[PDB]
């Protein structure tokens, strides 16, 4: 992540991020709504960061330092550039909505009142079709990626040295190769939990309650479509095992 965004999202909550004199100006219900919106953006910032570790630290480091067989790096990190594109664009929209809401003279005091429309746009039309296509491919290649990583770590000396070198710093504690793959697979199913809790504290404006209700339905439709399009690929599986599924 970039320092500007890390500092803006360093506090455990929105109520601790904004100045205490600004906090005192809002109703309890608004503080509750804002704390959950802050959690959605803060976890989106961390998810984009997980994708950057996978693309820049792992994938590009293996291409530039190791001599793996062709198609090995793609097998380890399937769809990482497409995933990074989807989520960096979504994070950009979330951060621009926060930026526009900043009070003049402040880089931390803001209130987001219109999240619903942004969530409807992300989870409808072409962006939803690309999220569905990318996660259906990624999640179907998840088991194959873990198995390929385990094989390389156990048989390749230079690969093992590479992994131990780039994962040694404490900031990489939770972000080993397999950990990154599961963090990404689990991201999509965190959205209904966050959205429903935001909706719980968004009854003040009827149009916002309606927009978030629509967004929740769109997220669940995307999840059901991805779940129904998954079939784990396996290295070595024969056609007979596949058509006898």
């Amino acid at each position: 992540s970039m320092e500007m965004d890390e500092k803006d999202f360093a506090a455990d909550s929105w109520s601790l991020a904004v100045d205490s004199s600004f906090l005192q100006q809002h109703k309890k219900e608004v503080m509750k709504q804002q704390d959950v919106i802050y959690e959605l953006i803060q976890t989106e910032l961390h998810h984009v960061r997980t994708l950057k570790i996978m693309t820049r630290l792992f994938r590009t480091g293996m291409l530039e330092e190791l001599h793996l067989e062709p198609g090995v790096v793609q097998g380890l990190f399937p769809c990482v550039d497409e995933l990074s594109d989807i989520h960096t664009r979504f994070l950009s929209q979330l951060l621009e909505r926060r930026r526009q809401a900043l009070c003049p003279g402040s880089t931390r005091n803001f209130v987001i009142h219109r999240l619903g429309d942004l969530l409807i746009s992300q989870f409808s039309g072409p962006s939803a079709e690309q999220m569905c296509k990318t996660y259906s491919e990624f999640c179907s290649r998840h088991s194959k990626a873990l198995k390929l990583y385990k094989e390389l770590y156990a048989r390749d000396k230079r690969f093992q040295q590479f992994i131990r070198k780039v994962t040694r710093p404490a900031v990489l504690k939770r972000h080993g190769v397999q950990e990154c793959i599961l963090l990404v697979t689990q991201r999509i199913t965190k959205y209904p939990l966050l959205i429903s809790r935001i909706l719980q504290h968004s009854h003040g404006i009827e149009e916002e309650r309606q927009d978030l209700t629509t967004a929740l339905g769109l997220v669940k439709e995307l999840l059901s479509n991805v779940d129904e399009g998954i079939y784990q690929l396996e290295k070595g599986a024969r056609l007979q095992e596949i058509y006898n599924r």
Binding site: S13, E39, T43, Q178, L182, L183, Y191, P192, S224, Y231
Partner: protein, 179 residues
């Protein structure tokens, strides 16, 4: 330090997310209780052995039967949770969660955990449950279900007060170290 993987399973109302959060911070959040848990690697020393225990939650995956099994590969210990304020969560353990965990995690120890033990003697909980001809899960009902499903053990805890939380994760570490 050896690396071990822990996954928590159970119904949405079982309090699994809150349990992982309270353990990872060694604190019940004073200002904001997070809605979700990403992952965490806990440094634990149990009976003289140092372990890095990776923690994973399955919350949000309950209705997605093809996404949910992707959390299971190379799991070393399962925490199977139910809520003591919800006898309905305990009934879902033997023929929904247990056969799924035995299929995707063969031979992995399972610790059956009764969460929200602080609600067992809560008057509001007792009044609400009595309307559906129910009462908080008794300690012997928890032990009998754990025995029945072939669990490694049965434990109780309260994320609210922190009582029993540390014990659950130290025992899960011991279970993950066994042959």
């Amino acid at each position: 330090a050896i690396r071990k993987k822990l996954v928590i399973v159970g119904d949405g109302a079982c309090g699994k997310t809150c349990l992982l959060i309270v353990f990872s911070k060694d604190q019940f959040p004073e200002v904001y209780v997070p809605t979700v848990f990403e992952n965490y690697v806990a440094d634990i020393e149990v009976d003289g052995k140092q372990v890095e225990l990776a923690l994973w939650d399955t919350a949000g995956q309950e209705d997605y039967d093809r996404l949910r099994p992707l959390s299971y590969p190379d799991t070393d210990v399962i925490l199977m949770c139910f809520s003591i304020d919800s006898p309905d969560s305990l009934e879902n353990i033997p023929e929904k969660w247990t056969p799924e965990v035995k299929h995707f995690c063969p031979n992995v120890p399972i610790i059956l955990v009764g969460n929200k033990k602080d609600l067992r003697n809560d008057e509001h909980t007792r009044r609400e449950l009595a309307k559906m001809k129910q009462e908080p899960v008794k300690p012997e009902e928890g032990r009998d279900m754990a025995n029945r499903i072939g669990a490694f053990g049965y434990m109780e805890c309260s994320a609210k007060t922190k009582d029993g939380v540390r014990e659950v994760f130290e025992m899960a570490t011991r279970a993950a170290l066994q042959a």
